[PDB]
Design a protein around this ligand. Structure first.
Ligand SMILES: C[C@@H]1O[C@@H](O)[C@@H](O)[C@H](O)[C@@H]1O
Ligand SMILES: C[C@@H]1O[C@@H](O)[C@@H](O)[C@H](O)[C@@H]1O
Ligand SMILES: C[C@@H]1O[C@@H](O)[C@@H](O)[C@H](O)[C@@H]1O
Ligand SMILES: C[C@H](O)[C@@H](O)[C@@H](O)C(=O)CO
Ligand SMILES: C[C@H](O)[C@@H](O)[C@@H](O)C(=O)CO
Ligand SMILES: C[C@H](O)[C@@H](O)[C@@H](O)C(=O)CO
Ligand SMILES: [Mn+2]
Ligand SMILES: [Mn+2]
Ligand SMILES: [Mn+2]
Lengths: 587, 587, 604
């Protein structure tokens, strides 16, 4: 995990003998306010505070712009924010970097035309096709007012979180383990997508590597022993649903517990390397694949023979193991790289682990009544979705973490001992259903606490357009206990469950919960704690991915200012137009 | 100012031995009705009545179409209107000129298929990609009914005014004086825009020319003397806000009054020439630059040394000076050529002078209450915009002209003596603020009467798309006198002020007055008397400039009939599509 | 360094200066370790080391400094080493990449993904390991992923443990480096228009999209009133001025006055105009690069300049109609010395012909030699020469020639008075001897401007470029809907017989400077005849450099995805990214247009 910085660029009126000198402090202050707001509010996936850099001076004329540019280049700046309380020149003071986002915050004061620079400099951005965000506060502020108003903070932080996400993906890899899984689209990996849109590389390992490392001892054995121990004490084997002649013996299941632990270790070591492997004389294997995100093909070839990926998938995505509480490793079942990236967007925006799930069933109220007798009320009133992965899910997905007595998924550094324990307690691990996975393994079974605000997310590849994003904000549901159990046993009671109801709007594909599912573009979703729809819209716009479907309210949509020039009425079409024309960042 | 004509083309059923002869008069009459409606209702910027030409005969077969075409070519026709009460052939009778607008008015009668030609001939236009407007009245009329119904007149006149505007720009120049002003986008002049969209040329003069003409006596000295005299008697020097050591002596200010007068003269002579200059033996300079519109870079290089452009800018845009009441010369501060064209659209559509202004502040109700104590009511109820140029503004912008006891900006030929006097009385000219303009000059200070209906307009260049138009209909505001003075002194009390509130619609960027400002694409606006939004939409469509933002009601949107084929539901997207595909007129 | 109040003032010596873009050198290696990788480490890192030595010991920045190279933190075997590398280059100001290897490496795992900079790959032509094999493989990935890369592959199999770079490889590495560096040097700098459009000249209608999209460059502009403001307000170094005036009096011979009788200026006026043009120089120079002395004299805003690597003075019409012209200014900006000493030139366009300026800059940055700005004035056919002079042309002039002669100004370096091995050349400033500076000054005078064209006055530059010097005439033109296209014509300056020279000169504009130019004809395309070459020249201006740099420009242009519409470079010298050949191998021109078309400018 690198530390992309935000460059704060304080532009000023270049005229001296009065004007410039009188604005120096006020201008430099706006920069500091912003550096501070970011560095005290946002954190990298590793929990360290975000870092900003200010331009070496205020920017009144081009050479100051150049020096600012000089400094940012060697400072690993992934986005810029310009701030000004006055009029400044524009093409003379603007950042020209075409490969990063930019925001301009123009102080809404009267003494000095701050808003006038803002709009002028953004005209130049639109005219020169360098997308920039415009941040203009609602209320005239006093020339001395030191505060960042609330509307401005919201825009600054949305921007910064979105920008940071682009900053963190850049130059990292997606690691495929295997390749295509059962003809699943997102598992037919498209490097052009990663390269053009995300600035990302593609790495690739045949699953035989897993076997190789196992046969040849290419993993930490002190670590294996500590892990076996930890797993026995912490991980409860669940009910075996397997038919008589497929039920594995206790010996065989025990051997498989060892195996799937080894799998988890190897996956980790693949993604990020492991110094320990150099100590054991596997100097090459030790470096890893530089993967911020990976996936495991699994079915059919691997899972037909060897224990499945559930354990590995589950724990890679979970914020702890025998080594302690930690960042997750964003990881995709069935090597669904599109779902992986969907999860990755969510993760970089929140610093929270991410649920991978099949969108399994839509339950209409009529069908629940028929099958269960129960009439749905509250959030489930309008029907809902059975989100359930084919074996694995982040343990944080239980929703056992708590804030203000409500369920959440937390960044790892905020997790309490008791919370980790609760996730463990409320999960068991049923043997793999051997008709689907002759090779065995152990799935992950739990039920996500209800009444938890979440966003469900999917990237899809549309031929001849590229990626499109769909967003669905909603809430998890708790159902009556009898209702849950009827719908569970009828579906896959061996796998983890989340009951999801999306917020309806009466607009678009959100007229009804059916319409949502009927417009979902894959069998998979990434599900995050939090209502992060607006954040995703912004990120999408930074990366020029059109948003085909969302239920974020129009007022929170925050896009580079030049999107408006493609239209203000038909935001969706304006969006496709802008993305179409600008194309990906790294064409 | 040339006199573009409208070609009226009366098409008829070619079948004789009865049918044709029986329709001759009725058809020829429709033409005359239309020629008359236009020539008695519309006027050129010089006040002369618009001129029409009818085809040399009715058009029943191609050779009549050809003769019509022959005649129009040598008749300086800038748009056509076909009129018919009957069925006619279509591809046989249609105008093929691809570089001008066309309208078809099909009489809504029953005896004879007039509406049937209308729709057929427009199909051909759409099929052959020659955009045409369709003008069809709501109510069946009697075969003898000689009247142009109201819905038809509205469409005919909207079309004609829009068409005439394209007619008047064509083959004229924009003159830059200087080039880029303080990195302002619209001042980085794009000749492709002028050439491709407006059929216009680009002329260019370094500001040194101004100095040259001054040192070398290249202006009318009899005119200078009459002007000095007139300015002393009519122009009141305003309060000097300059700090002690910058305040200029009375001698020095007097020298500067002479200078800025000379500036005004030279600008005029540059734009349009001056026979007087040939008499004084400056035969070359006398021809001018053929500019229908120009701009003056001003800052930073000129204004840092010499008296600023305010006076010149102000009077060029004002409908009188020491030589009497007259057409304005559309003229842009800071050489903002985009604002200049915005003003020019407005001007050719109305024959009224045009306010150039920075969109300075958005005043929310919360902020007014905080700063002033006052709670806004009436039109200002929902917040408003401080429109204020950095020194200059058409004196007609005072709003001292009156119709039915309401403030207006009038075409010059309608101005009364007392009205001109009132504009003068209610304006003074404060010395230039020398921290911004070391070189001095005198700004233009007044406050625009409130409760005046206006449209604010801006053209923006969107990279890889081209120009896009934004329209904002609203009203000027009168604020409580204490309220005005607080907001003024706090901003720039030395410059001219217009308080603007746009009409909100709940659609698009017009949900709130903030949203309007937040979606304004430049620091500048052109502001015209009148609600001319619908006229601008039409003109935009003629020139294939997409409209990105407007608050004109959907029912008044009047575009070539083939726009509907790009869609009837999503008018904005249909619009971008059509403009995208057709491209500019002179590609 | 920071102002006591707000914000920046020139460190300095000057404010904006010549950047030091690095070439990043990536040694890639086989990832396998139970013997193989270790066995190749040394030979691999040597390749890298020796390439960095080749570049740093041969090539210099415009300021005379050795070019800087950066090596990857390690040999590159798997992605994470590539990431460590990219991580280093991102903060080391790397303008281009060279991958070297003697062995097989894992293509897409090891490749550089930067889309905004050139990449070359050199595969050791050895037998022991698949070096070329990596070369072809990784180049295939570049073409598949649309990230252009150059392929350097030596003609003759080398022994493992030969550490000499073969001559043919050297040629390619240095052509690449030279071109790559020109890209890196232009990037993030600005073009400053002084004035804007001059007499309706195309390239003087400055096009920011070109600068931004193609060159990664900014556009600055001041109206020429800024000169008058500075002159009137003393915004220029007056101590400097006094030295300059004295040096000019001593070193600048005023030329014969050709003016119409009633337009001839008095000695008093001429002397005033002399002071004026010197201040114009100082001011134009100050505008471009800034001046610490301006800060000292209290003009802190001004002191900073316009970050201008290249600039232009509009002049005509409205300045030169009134004040002395910019000939003196344009001349000395492009000349490699003045009162302050021998010095890099400041690349500078007459008539604000920005495209000429960019053509000049291409040349400057490829060669470190100053640049001739010319009107391509007249094509002299042998028949017209015979008719007009009675002389039958021979040697390099035999097939006719072009009269190259700017409308007043030209680099004094373009006299061709500097010398190497008996031959006339133009040199980088740091190689110029005293004799040579002196020679130039002695072979140039400065005629009063022609007041029928320049009522304001001033002084033109007049000299004759020495014949028999290899030169390249260059021009970028803008094609609507395509973008920039580049035309190149290699040839020689000519020494005409003296009678022929004076007859032709005096019919033309003997007040201006002359280069007589013969382009190498090839029988191909527009180089069938000297006439054909002029008839296909796309502008009234050209940029002429010493040397034959056609191949270097071709490589440059491919890097910036600028097509070459016309060049006389031998086909075997054409050195473009490997993927250009996937666009075709017979029609190199069309392939080049398709490739530029598709890839587009670096920074769209
Ligand atoms: C149950 C979990 O086991 C290990 O991860 C411990 O290090 C954690 O802190 C937690 O107690
Ligand atoms: C005050 C104005 O002065 C001159 O323009 C007169 O010709 C006008 O008619 C008017 O009176
Ligand atoms: C005319 C003189 O020529 C050389 O002597 C230079 O070293 C001096 O600086 C001056 O340029
Ligand atoms: C268990 C199932 O057969 C799985 O193989 C498959 O349905 C999925 O997980 C859906 O992608
Ligand atoms: C007076 C100001 O400094 C002006 O130079 C500038 O703000 C404008 O007029 C805005 O375009
Ligand atoms: C004297 C003429 O006007 C010259 O200035 C003219 O031929 C040129 O320089 C063409 O660029
Ligand atoms: Mn699945
Ligand atoms: Mn302004
Ligand atoms: Mn010339």
């Amino acid at each position: 995990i690198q530390h992309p910085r935000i460059g704060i660029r304080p532009t000023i009126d270049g005229r001296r003998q009065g004007v410039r000198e009188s604005l120096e402090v006020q201008t430099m202050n706006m920069a500091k306010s912003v550096a501070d707001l970011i560095s005290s509010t946002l954190k990298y996936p590793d929990g360290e505070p975000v870092e900003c850099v200010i331009s070496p001076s205020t920017i009144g004329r081009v050479p100051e712009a150049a020096a600012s540019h000089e400094l940012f280049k060697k400072s690993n700046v992934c986005a810029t924010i310009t701030v000004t309380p006055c009029w400044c020149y524009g093409s003379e003071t603007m950042d020209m970097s075409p490969d990063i986002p930019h925001a301009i915050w123009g102080f809404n004061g009267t003494e000095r035309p701050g808003a006038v620079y803002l709009a002028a400099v953004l005209a130049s951005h639109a005219q020169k096709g360098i997308p920039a965000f415009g941040i203009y506060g609602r209320d005239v502020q006093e020339a001395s007012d030191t505060d960042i108003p609330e509307d401005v903070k919201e825009k600054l932080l949305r921007y910064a979180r979105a920008a940071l996400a682009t900053g963190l993906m850049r130059d990292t890899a997606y690691l495929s383990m295997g390749s295509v899984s059962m003809g699943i689209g997102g598992s037919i990996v498209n490097p052009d997508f990663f390269q053009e849109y995300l600035g990302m590389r593609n790495e690739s390992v045949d699953m035989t590597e897993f076997t190789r490392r196992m046969d040849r001892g290419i993993y930490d054995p002190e670590e294996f022993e500590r892990a076996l121990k930890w797993v026995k004490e912490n991980v409860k084997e669940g009910f075996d649903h397997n038919r008589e002649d497929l039920v594995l013996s206790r010996e065989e299941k025990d051997r498989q517990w060892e195996f799937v632990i080894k799998m988890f270790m190897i996956g980790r070591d693949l993604m990020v390397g492991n110094p320990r492997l150099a100590e054991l004389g596997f100097e090459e294997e030790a470096v890893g694949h530089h993967a911020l995100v990976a996936g495991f093909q699994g079915q059919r070839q691997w899972t037909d023979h060897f224990p499945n990926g559930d354990f590995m998938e589950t724990f890679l995505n979970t914020q702890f193991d025998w080594n302690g509480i930690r960042k997750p490793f964003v990881f995709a079942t069935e090597n669904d790289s599109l779902n992986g990236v969907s999860m990755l967007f969510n993760y970089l925006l929140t610093n929270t682990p991410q649920i991978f799930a099949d969108v399994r069933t839509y339950w209409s109220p009529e069908a629940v009544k028929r099958v269960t007798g129960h009439t749905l009320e509250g959030r489930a009133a309008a029907g809902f979705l059975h989100l359930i992965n084919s074996g694995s899910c982040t343990l944080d997905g239980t929703g056992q973490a708590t804030r203000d007595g409500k369920p959440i998924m937390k960044p790892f550094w905020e997790l309490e001992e008791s919370e980790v324990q609760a996730m463990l307690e409320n999960t068991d691990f049923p043997p793999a259903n051997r008709e689907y996975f002759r090779g065995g393994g152990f799935s992950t079974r739990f039920l996500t606490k209800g009444d938890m605000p979440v966003t469900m997310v999917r990237l899809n590849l549309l031929k001849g357009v590229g990626p499109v994003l769909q967003i669905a904000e909603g809430y998890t549901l708790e159902l009556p206990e009898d209702v849950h159990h009827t719908l569970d046993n009828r579906t896959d009671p061996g796998w983890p469950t989340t009951w999801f109801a999306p917020r309806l709007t009466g607009k678009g594909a959100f007229k009804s919960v059916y319409d949502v599912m009927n417009n979902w573009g894959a069998n998979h979703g990434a599900i995050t704690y939090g209502h992060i729809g607006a954040d995703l819209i912004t990120l999408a716009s930074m990366l020029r991915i059109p948003v085909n479907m969302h239920n974020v309210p129009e007022e929170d949509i925050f896009r580079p200012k030049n999107w408006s020039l493609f239209g203000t009425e038909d935001l969706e079409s304006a969006d496709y137009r802008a993305c179409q024309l600008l194309g990906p960042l790294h064409k």
